[PDB]
Specification:
The complex is a heterotrimer of chains A (520), B (6) and C (549). Chain A is built from six helices and 24 strands. With 520 residues, chain A is α/β, with parallel strands linked by helices. Chain A has a 22-stranded parallel sheet that branches. Chain A has a two-stranded parallel sheet with strand order 4-6. By secondary structure, chain C is mainly β. Chain C is flat, with a radius of gyration of 30 Å. Classes of the chains: A alpha/beta (520), B little secondary structure (6), C mainly beta (549). Chains in contact: A-B, A-C, B-C. The interface between A and C is medium-sized, with 17 and 17 residues. Chain A: One of its GO terms (biological process) is positive regulation of interleukin-6 production.
């Protein structure tokens, strides 16, 4: 019996009163509430989840929840809390006090009795190793710690050592050069996340940040590392990459990067890594004068299996200098063109390649890029401006390709003259296809075909009869001509193979489902 | 935007 | 086998004509023997046709043509013998021709024009397409003798192995000379004899890598060339400079063009030699389309060309992977008025640098049609440095929306937001606009106060209601076709006092009597104004002609 009351973004100045006593989840986030009285919630005996984030509460008396014995989730993040009065509370599983104005770590000795505490959000401008002692015995899943904008003076390197968490996320101050010495290598952490990192001074480039990262080598438990909001030079960025390369991390994620300067550090050492996956998202770079290949060479020669780069202005990518272990590459949402990986014979192990949202145009050239990719099984080149010139003749696709996504391009029916033999999944929605040629019957392995949102008015009689493997077909959003002596086959086929049709193809003008037309 | 090196 | 028209214009329908019909009707003026099984052509099969001037024998497989067969046509103009098998021509056929204008012999196995001064008595031709990209390898003075004036001269000399001197210096004037040539061996010597005779020169398929320029003894005779086009040509950084030295031999050159060429380099050009430094001359327009550069991602900042940028007024660099026009370079192009960077890789951060303070100071028109722009607001703010910019085409860029307010160059007059994927239009659009195109989008309504808008293109949208006419007083043109418009306010067209053209076709006009009385009546006297013809949703009967009781 889950009852929910959402009064978020209502411009409320007080906790809304007179709410159902059935309420189990109250969400009054994003308002102008400044106080929480016991009388505001004492009747909500079934309250299990309370969200009062993004409000303006400055002080909070924890005894105010004494009548809410079902409470297990409390989110007071993003308020103006400077003080919390300690009193025995319920056994919370989730307590979020992050993004507030606390000077000292808001840890009550009482929190030590919260045996079921999985998530703990905190805030501080000052951090003492001892203030964590009250919850040191607790096996917390994730701890989020936001350091105030004035954090820094009289800093204790061992400040985090007593935390006992599996996952830890440290949010450093914004708009301030990184000059912190707080050791982020914690004994129990497998998943580490660090955010706001800025060191734009080439001289003594990120020595402080690189120093704390260096200390991560001594932590064999570290398995995942995530860096957010980085503002640095090209040299430092590459040093960060190099340093992490030799740690024990398996999964490395970087997002929201601002780069400047000239890249001089090209000598990358790929040896001794444990990295399985590297992803980089949203990168903006200032203009520069060094050859772009300096960047591409570093990434193209990485000895990892999974690599993703999205939301950057990368206009090209080079072929690896030696047979590469790349298995899955996701280069969606960049500025790549038809010549990416051209003249390559080193991506022989690549199984998946995503090139969605780039600047692709000529299909023939894309197919050639594919010729030596002997293990390629899935290829996505959707949301580009791809067209095929039949005058180029047969395409050179690898025979291993099984799933091909070419939706949202400008392909015509000539596309059926340029398709991999063993193709199983072919997505062609949102193109300029005006007909389905006879060549389609050669696709013996075709299981899923999507030709929705094109310009098909009809199909040849019996066109689908030789597609014995077919299981799914999309034909909707096409201007189907339902005049009887022409729509007969399709209407009948669509009726007998009802389970296969995804969506509902409809008649142009009439609007009636093709499946329902009957001819004499 | 490579800068001529000389 | 023909289906002649009511004017004597015979069409060669069923393509299987073994030969030319037996004595065709002389009242024929035109024919059509395009792609038909032919091999023999004599005078006794088209004899009674002196009134025939339009002869088209495109791709037939003609092996031999009996002489004296073009006199039976007497005054023949459009003479076509394209892509056949006439491997041995003869001035005999170019003897009966009295009033000829178009002679095309491209695609035939012949490898010469014979040492018997071909093309003579046809002293009326203006267009002559001679050659084949297979075996034509010789051009002597014994060719192009019976012609001193012609508009277009196309010579497919792909495998040209030898060129007899002055074989082209005969013709005095050629408005457009098209030359096909793979190697550049005989390029300088063919140039010396045409430089003072041609106006628009075009070189095709030539490999200009290693092309070296040597001061040719052509004399101080001024060149007649004003436009020099290079199509499907291969060039390197060094040879490009050599080509420049050649261009400096055409002081009157005004327009330079490169279509589908390949630059095997990174733009490390030299702007000077040991003797003559490259002069900008009077070149005012540079057009580059689909320039293939293998290492485009390694291209230089072009600072080695700063001394050739001060005077050019129009530049087009289309579909060539342009991701940046360096700020310093943009500042040097002080006369540039028109810049087209369509179908490239431009994004906001780099457009900002390209359009830095003082960049393209004189620019009035900027075209960034198919690039990678995403934010209208940021795109607009970036252009504020171009104080005299008045025309912006950013169509085919995926902006999905626009904020309530935006900043645009003060004198904005034309804005193209076609195929932009926008759902609505706001105050972001600048008030100074004279021409606005928001066609091919997802617009439902249009209510913008544009006091001096003369043209509104909003076809291919989903407009239920007509665009607010009370806010478009000066509206002269209004394309509102293909929009899902059913009704329309009464007297609404009385607002547009200067309307001249209007598109209304392809809209579900509900022609019920208690509604369309106004519209259906407005389209009457206002007939010249209507473009195409609006129809009724329940009948293909036009709305312009239907009055109500
Ligand atoms: C690093 C970037 C830079 O590329 C650009 O800056 C974009 C090109 C726009 C400017 C073209 C230069 C204008 C020259 C004017 C000359 C006036 C006439 C002089 C007398 C004849 O590179 C890229 O973003 C990737 C490649 C983009 C295409 C680069 C091709 C530009 C080549 C210019 C050749 C000009 C040759 C003129 C003399 C024949
Ligand atoms: C091929 O790649 C394209 C991506 O370009 C995939 O299409 C996308 O598929 C998703 C999931 O089906 C679509 O999401 C849908 O969004 C609508 C509206 O937001 C929502 O109502 C649906 O419930 C669903 O979430 C998305 O619209 C679509 N994107 C585009 C541009 O069409 C496609 O699935 C890939 N094909 C294969 C075989 O994987
Ligand atoms: C390396 O990149 C791979 C992407 O190609 C990625 O594999 C993908 O993993 C997802 C799981 O997140 C699979 O999707 C699954 O989605 C739901 C899970 O609830 C279920 O329908 C199925 O279990 C389904 O498999 C994708 O299928 C899978 N893609 C492929 C082709 O393998 C790997 O996880 C990445 N490896 C690392 C270490 O990051
Ligand atoms: C309590 O009420 C909050 C405000 O109404 C909810 O919030 C969320 O709203 C949606 C849905 O979860 C999400 O919105 C963001 O989506 C993406 C990711 O950030 C962005 O497009 C953008 O930032 C949107 O704001 C977020 O999850 C969150 N957004 C907001 C407004 O803060 C909240 O989910 C709800 N809590 C519960 C459990 O009911
Ligand atoms: C000449 O190229 C001068 C620089 C032009 C601007 C830079 C365009 C390319 C930007 C590359 C960004 C790469 C992001 C990180 C990818 C891993
Ligand atoms: C924490 O986990 C350890 C190891 O499983 C266990 O010995 C200890 O009792 C746990 N402490 C509590 C009560 O969370
Ligand atoms: C703007 O263009 C006009 C053309 O009429 C020109 O006269 C004027 O000098 C230009 N403005 C400047 C100085 O940028
Ligand atoms: C706007 O740009 C499109 C191409 O994107 C073009 O077809 C159209 O003519 C332009 N509009 C105007 C009014 O020039
Ligand atoms: C030839 O005549 C044309 C006529 O348009 C003229 O433009 C051209 O200058 C003349 N060339 C010379 C100098 O013979």
């Amino acid at each position: 019996s889950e009852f929910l009351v959402d009064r978020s973004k209502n411009g409320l100045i007080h906790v809304p009163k007179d709410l159902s006593q059935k309420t189990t989840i109250l969400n009054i986030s994003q308002n102008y509430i400044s106080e929480l009285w016991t009388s505001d919630i004492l009747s909500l005996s079934k309250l299990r989840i309370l969200i009062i984030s993004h409000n303006r509460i400055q002080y909070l008396d924890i005894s105010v929840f004494k009548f809410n014995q079902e409470l297990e989730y409390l989110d007071l993040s993003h308020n103006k809390l400077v003080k919390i009065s300690c009193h025995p509370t319920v056994n919370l599983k989730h307590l979020d006090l992050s993004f507030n104005a606390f000077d000292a770590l808001p840890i009550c000795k009482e929190f030590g009795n919260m045996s079921q505490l999985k998530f703990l959000g905190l805030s501080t401008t000052h951090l003492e190793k001892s203030s964590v002692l009250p919850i040191a015995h607790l096996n917390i899943s994730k701890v989020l710690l936001v350091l105030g904008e004035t954090y820094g003076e009289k800093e204790d390197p061992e400040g985090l050592q007593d935390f006992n968490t599996e996952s830890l996320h440290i949010v450093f101050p914004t708009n301030k050069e990184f000059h912190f010495i707080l050791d982020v290598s914690v004994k129990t952490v497998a998943n580490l996340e660090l955010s706001n990192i800025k060191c734009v001074l080439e001289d003594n480039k990120c020595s402080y940040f690189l120093s704390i990262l260096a200390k991560l080598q001594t932590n064999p438990k570290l398995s995942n590392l995530t860096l957010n909001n980085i503002e640095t030079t090209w040299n430092s960025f590459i040093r960060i990459l190099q340093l992490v390369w030799h740690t024990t991390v398996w999964y490395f994620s970087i997002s929201n990067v601002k780069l400047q300067g000239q890249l001089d550090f090209r000598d990358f050492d790929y040896s001794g890594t444990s990295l399985k996956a590297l992803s980089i998202h949203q990168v903006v770079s200032d203009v520069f004068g060094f050859p772009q290949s300096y960047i591409y060479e570093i990434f193209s020669n990485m000895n990892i299996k999974n690599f993703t780069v999205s939301g950057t202005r990368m206009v090209h990518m080079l072929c690896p200098s030696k047979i590469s272990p790349f298995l899955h590459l996701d280069f969606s949402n960049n500025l790549l063109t038809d010549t990416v990986f051209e003249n390559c014979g080193h991506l022989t192990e690549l199984e998946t390649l995503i090139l969605q949202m780039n600047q692709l145009k000529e299909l023939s050239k894309i197919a050639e890029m594919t010729t030596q990719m002997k293990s390629l099984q899935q290829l996505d080149i959707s949301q580009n401006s791809v067209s095929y010139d039949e005058k180029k003749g047969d395409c050179s696709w690898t025979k291993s390709l099984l799933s091909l996504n070419m939706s949202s391009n400008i392909l015509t029916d000539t596309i059926f003259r340029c398709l991999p033999p063993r193709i199983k999944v072919l997505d062609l929605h949102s193109n300029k296809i005006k007909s389905i040629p006879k060549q389609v019957v050669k696709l013996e392995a075709l299981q899923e075909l999507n030709v929705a949102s094109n310009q098909l008015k009809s199909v040849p009689d019996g066109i689908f009869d030789r597609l014995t493997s077919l299981q799914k077909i999309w034909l909707h959003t096409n201007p189907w001509d339902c005049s009887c002596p022409r729509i007969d086959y399709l209407s009948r086929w669509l009726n007998k193979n009802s389970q296969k049709e995804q969506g509902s193809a409809k008649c142009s003008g009439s609007g009636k489902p093709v499946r329902s037309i009957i001819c004499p | 935007x490579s800068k001529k090196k000389k | 086998s023909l289906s002649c028209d009511r004017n004597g214009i015979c069409k060669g329908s069923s393509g299987s004509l073994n030969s030319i019909p037996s004595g065709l009707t002389e009242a024929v003026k035109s024919l059509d023997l395009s792609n038909n099984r032919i091999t023999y052509i004599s005078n006794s099969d088209l004899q009674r046709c002196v009134n025939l001037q339009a002869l088209v024998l495109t791709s037939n497989g003609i092996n031999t043509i009996e002489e004296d067969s073009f006199s039976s046509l007497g005054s023949l103009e459009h003479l076509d013998l394209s892509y056949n098998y006439l491997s041995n021509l003869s001035s005999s056929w170019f003897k009966p021709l009295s009033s000829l204008t178009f002679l095309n012999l491209l695609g035939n196995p012949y490898k010469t024009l014979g040492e018997t001064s071909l093309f003579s008595h046809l002293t009326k031709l203006q267009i002559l397409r001679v050659g084949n990209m297979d075996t034509f390898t010789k051009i002597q003075r014994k060719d192009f003798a019976g012609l001193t004036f012609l508009e277009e001269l196309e010579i497919d000399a792909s495998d040209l192995q030898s060129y007899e001197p002055k074989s082209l210096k005969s013709i005095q004037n050629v408005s457009h000379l098209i030359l096909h040539m793979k190697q550049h061996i005989l390029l300088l010597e063919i140039f010396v004899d045409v430089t003072s005779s041609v106006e628009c020169l075009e070189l095709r398929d030539t490999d200009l890598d290693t092309f070296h320029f040597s001061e040719l003894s052509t004399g101080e005779t001024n060149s007649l060339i004003k436009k020099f086009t290079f199509r499907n040509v291969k060039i390197t950084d060094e040879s490009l400079f050599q080509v420049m030295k050649l261009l400096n031999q055409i002081s009157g050159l005004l327009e330079l063009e490169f279509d589908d060429c390949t630059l095997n380099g990174v733009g490390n050009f030299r702007a000077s030699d040991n003797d003559r430094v490259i002069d900008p001359g009077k070149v005012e327009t540079l057009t580059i389309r689909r320039l293939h550069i293998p290492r485009f991602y390694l291209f230089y900042d072009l600072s080695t060309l700063y001394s050739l940028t001060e005077r050019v007024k129009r530049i087009t660099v289309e579909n060539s992977k342009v991701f940046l026009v360096p700020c310093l370079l943009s500042q040097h192009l002080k006369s540039l008025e028109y810049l087209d960077l369509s179908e490239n890789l431009m994004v906001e951060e780099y457009l900002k640098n390209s359009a830095c303070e003082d960049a393209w100071p004189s620019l009035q028109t900027l075209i960034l049609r198919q690039n990678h722009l995403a934010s209208l607001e940021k795109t607009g703010e970036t252009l504020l440095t171009l104080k005299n910019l008045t025309n912006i085409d950013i169509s085919k860029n995926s902006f999905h929306s626009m904020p309530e307010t935006c900043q645009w160059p003060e004198k904005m007059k034309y804005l193209n937001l076609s195929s932009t994927r926008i759902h609505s239009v706001t105050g972001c659009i600048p008030k100074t606009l004279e021409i606005l195109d928001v066609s091919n989008n997802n617009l439902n309504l249009f209510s913008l106060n544009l006091p001096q808008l003369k043209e509104l293109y909003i076809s291919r949208n989903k407009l239920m209601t007509l665009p607010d006419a009370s806010l478009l007083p000066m509206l002269l043109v209004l394309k509102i076709s293909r929009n899902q418009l059913k009704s329309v306010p009464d007297g609404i067209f009385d607002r547009l006092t200067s309307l001249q053209k209007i598109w209304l076709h392809t809209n579900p006009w509900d022609c019920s009597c208690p509604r369309i009385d106004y519209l259906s009546r407005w389209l009457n006297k206002n007939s010249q104004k209507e473009q195409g013809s609006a129809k009724c949703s329940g009948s293909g009967k036009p709305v312009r002609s239907i009055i109500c009781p």
